[PDB]
Amino acid sequence: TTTQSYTNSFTRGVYYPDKVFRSSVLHLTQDLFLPFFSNVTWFHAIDNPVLPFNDGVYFASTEKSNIIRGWIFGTTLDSKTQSLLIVNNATNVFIKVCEFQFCNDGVYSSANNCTFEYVSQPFLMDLEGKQGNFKNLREFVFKNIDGYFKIYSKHTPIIGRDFPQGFSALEPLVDLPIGINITRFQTLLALNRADYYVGYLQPRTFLLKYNENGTITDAVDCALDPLSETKCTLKFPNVTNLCPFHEVFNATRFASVYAWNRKRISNCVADYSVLYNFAPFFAFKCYGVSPTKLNDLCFTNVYADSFVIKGNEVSQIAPGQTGNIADYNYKLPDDFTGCVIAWNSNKLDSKHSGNYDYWYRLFRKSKLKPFERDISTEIYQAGNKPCKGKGPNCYFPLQSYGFRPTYGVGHQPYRVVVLSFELLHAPATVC
Ligand SMILES: *[C@@H]1O[C@H](CO)[C@@H](O[C@@H]2O[C@H](CO)[C@@H](O)[C@H](O)[C@@H]2O)[C@H](O)[C@H]1NC(C)=O
Ligand SMILES: *[C@@H]1O[C@H](CO)[C@@H](O)[C@H](O)[C@H]1NC(C)=O
Ligand SMILES: *[C@@H]1O[C@H](CO)[C@@H](O)[C@H](O)[C@H]1NC(C)=O
Ligand SMILES: *[C@@H]1O[C@H](CO)[C@@H](O)[C@H](O)[C@H]1NC(C)=O
Ligand SMILES: *[C@@H]1O[C@H](CO)[C@@H](O)[C@H](O)[C@H]1NC(C)=O
Ligand SMILES: *[C@@H]1O[C@H](CO)[C@@H](O)[C@H](O)[C@H]1NC(C)=O
Ligand SMILES: *[C@@H]1O[C@H](CO)[C@@H](O)[C@H](O)[C@H]1NC(C)=O
């Protein structure tokens, strides 16, 4: 079973917003943070309630050695939507993104459209002074800002008070881009023959005091108390491996725009001159960076979203645009920093007697959020009758991009690959 008693969080759950060292400074940040004094649910164990996930979750736990392994994320937690899994097995982790089926207790039996996994050093550290009284308190913070699942942690012992209220910062451990939809949240247990602290983050403005050593000593909220609000107001590397752009441009089944195959590029040397050779460029509209000055810049990560679309939709693809593709199929974010590449390909998307392999979505319940995929076949509703049967007033969502060797250029196949560069203060992986 379990219990759902409520307690107070006090001044707890503040993590270094960036990776920028600061000294004798009173830097003010706006991001997701756990509100000061803000209602954290303390649970027990002796079944395992699936907790809602929104705007990140603050998770703390006090245990003897180990009874909590990891966490599960995703939506509907079934074999119809991709899901996460972060079990800290033994002295390592097991992070992965896969459409997990079920276990109802080997935590999954899914080996389908999965892979896309990330392993790393274990997130569980325990030390004892020859005695078990050293009940170290493990605090974690997770968030899913436009994917890029972020994870923060900090282990601190000498827990003489239930949920110490003293200040404690949180250091990041790993930042892997899952790029999925997360709404639910669940936790794993262990075996044997008082923990589960859970708080939710909300968008707040924090004012943080930084020590000369960079350690965050004190922080004050700016939306909690009149005094707090007033106080707030007054306050290239050793790489030679050429990037796989070759395959990116030498693929044969650049997917349809309804499933934009995103390709992450890292640990490589990006000489775009090869990118200039596998494509008589018809459109090289770069927004965040000048294409001439691309060989003197270092990007922490590069994303190569590849999809073939029609001619007008090439002009459609741009930051802040409109159309049946820019709303329901692929929406580039407004502050895009990257390049779009669209050369012609009427030799691989054509044949006599025709071809209709490709696809696109004219019918979605809402607009597509920036960099989000929506692969699903649901009949669009009309009137007040939910169909899923197909016909008038009952429409299938995606209609075909049937390509043939003889259309006008406005209808001719256009191979589009869009590069999303990362120009932000962080370890440079691509140069
Ligand atoms: C910031 O860094 C200083 C230089 O390392 C710290 O001073 C030291 O403190 C350690 C023990 O904490 C001593 O062993 C050493 O001799 C020296 O005095 C200083 O404490 C630290 N300030 C912090 C962590 O707030
Ligand atoms: C906060 O916790 C108190 C004590 O259990 C409870 O009465 C109150 O309703 C909680 N507020 C919210 C919004 O959860
Ligand atoms: C946990 O599972 C991962 C799966 O890749 C494995 O690499 C790791 O070695 C395991 N943990 C251990 C044995 O410490
Ligand atoms: C994987 O997804 C494709 C469509 O994207 C679907 O046809 C296929 O059945 C899926 N496989 C599984 C079971 O994950
Ligand atoms: C994440 O989950 C919801 C429900 O599954 C889904 O509609 C959407 O992709 C995400 N949330 C919203 C409303 O943006
Ligand atoms: C490259 O190797 C040299 C020699 O070992 C080392 O000093 C340097 O720090 C390395 N650079 C990077 C970015 O790893
Ligand atoms: C792909 O094939 C070879 C490399 O295998 C290359 O010469 C050719 O230009 C490539 N074609 C395109 C369109 O990228």
Author numbering: 23 to 68, 80 to 138, 158 to 210, 212 to 246, 263 to 304, 329 to 482, 484 to 525
Describing publication, verbatim:
To understand SARS-CoV-2 engagement of the HS cofactor and how the N354 glycan alters HS usage at the molecular level, we determined cryo-EM structures of XBB.1.5, BA.2.86, JN.1, and BA.2.86-T356K in complex with HS at 3.2–3.8 Å. Interestingly, incubation with HS led to marked conformational alteration, yielding substantially increased ‘RBD-up’ state in the N354 glycosylated S-trimers, but had limited impact in RBD conformation modulation for S-trimers without the N354 glycosylation. Due to structural heterogeneity and flexibility of HS, only the density for part of the HS basic unit, IdoA (2S) (2-O-sulfo-α-L-iduronic acid), is clear, allowing identification of the location of major binding sites and interactions. In contrast to binding of sialoglycan to the domain A (corresponding to the NTD in SARS-CoVs) in HKU1 and MERS-CoV, HS mainly targets a semi-open, shallow, elongated cavity composed of a number of positively charged residues on RBD, downstream within a deep groove, named the N354 pocket, constructed by the residues N354, R355, K/T356, and R357 from RBD and T157 and F168 from neighboring NTD, is occupied by the HS fragment. The HS fragment is poised to possibly interact with R355 and R357 through hydrogen bonds and a salt bridge, meanwhile residues K356, N354, R346, and R466 might contribute to further coordinate the oligosaccharide. Notably, the absence of the N354 glycan in the immediate vicinity of the binding groove probably facilitates unobstructed engagement of HS, in line with the observed affinity; however, the presence of the N354 glycan together with the bound HS widens the binding groove by 3 Å, pushing the neighboring NTD outwards and thereby conferring a relatively relaxed upper arrangement. Strikingly, all the N354 glycosylated SC2-VLPs exhibited a dose-dependent enhanced infectivity upon HS treatment, reaching up to the infectivity level for their parental variants and loss of the N354 glycosylation largely eliminated the HS-induced enhanced infectivity in BA.2.86, indicative of differential usage of HS as a cofactor for modulating infectivity of the N354 glycosylated variants in furin/hACE2 enriched microenvironments.
